[PDB]
Amino acid sequence: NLVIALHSYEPSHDGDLGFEKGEQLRILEQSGEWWKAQSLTTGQEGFIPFNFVAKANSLEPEPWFFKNLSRKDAERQLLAPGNTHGSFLIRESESTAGSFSLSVRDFDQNQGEVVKHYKIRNLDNGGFYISPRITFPGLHELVRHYTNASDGLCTRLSRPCQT
């Protein structure tokens, strides 16, 4: 039963478990507002405020995932300096239930900066795809695949868009 620390914590009361942002902890007891958690590193266990951790692999903490972004918003943000070719982000679709959209910094034929948009369609049960030939159990796996090979995308995904 595993979670990632959202911030660092230094024990205030006793019985408290200190931890650090990004640390992985297993949850031994889910009862109340203070959970009994286990450190995957040190094997250590104590009580933590529950709002300081999240399920691992959850979508929101991903540096490439952006909330409340329209197509034009994403395009704007990706064009802004600090982002270069290959920079990318994924946002939830505003017009279609269950689907997402990938935006990737690209170059036109004049070596000018442009942004390319790809619909990420959802598969009736588990997964996601851009091309129906290539499917993934989830968005993390999709991002990982196209980081490694562009496979029809304008370029391989590199740096998540700057916040």
Side-chain angles (χ1 to χ4, degrees), residues 82-113:
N83 304 292
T84 61
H85 191 65
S87 287
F88 78 102
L89 65 85
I90 292 186
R91 57 188 194 86
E92 188 177 356
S93 166
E94 307 180 326
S95 52
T96 305
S99 67
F100 299 81
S101 185
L102 163 67
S103 290
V104 185
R105 246 303 315 280
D106 195 19
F107 287 127
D108 60 37
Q109 71 181 347
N110 307 289
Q111 298 108 56
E113 295 182 18

Side-chain angles (χ1 to χ4, degrees), residues 14-35 37-71 73-152:
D14 297 340
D16 277 355
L17 179 61
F19 53 84
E20 283 158 7
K21 178 174 202 176
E23 176 166 2
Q24 313 197 320
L25 313 161
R26 181 163 79 265
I27 297 313
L28 307 187
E29 303 179 20
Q30 289 252 354
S31 189
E33 301 205 331
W34 291 72
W35 299 353
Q38 182 170 94
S39 177
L40 292 191
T41 314
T42 64
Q44 173 67 321
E45 69 200 51
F47 284 94
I48 60 162
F50 80 101
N51 58 287
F52 268 48
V53 302
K55 290 182 193 296
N57 215 53
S58 73
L59 194 48
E60 202 185 341
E62 296 299 338
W64 42 261
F65 182 78
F66 289 70
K67 285 178 72 177
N68 304 312
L69 237 54
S70 79
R71 174 190 185 91
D73 291 333
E75 172 150 336
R76 197 174 301 118
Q77 282 184 20
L78 274 176
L79 291 176
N83 304 292
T84 61
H85 191 65
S87 287
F88 78 102
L89 65 85
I90 292 186
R91 57 188 194 86
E92 188 177 356
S93 166
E94 307 180 326
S95 52
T96 305
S99 67
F100 299 81
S101 185
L102 163 67
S103 290
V104 185
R105 246 303 315 280
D106 195 19
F107 287 127
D108 60 37
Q109 71 181 347
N110 307 289
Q111 298 108 56
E113 295 182 18
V114 301
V115 173
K116 290 284 194 301
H117 299 283
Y118 308 97
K119 289 172 188 167
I120 300 167
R121 293 153 77 180
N122 66 301
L123 229 20
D124 9 65
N125 264 269
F128 296 99
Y129 67 91
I130 296 170
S131 165
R133 280 295 286 103
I134 323 174
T135 70
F136 311 96
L139 292 177
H140 304 74
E141 288 85 4
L142 185 155
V143 166
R144 201 176 60 197
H145 178 83
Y146 285 118
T147 293
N148 292 342
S150 74
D151 285 355

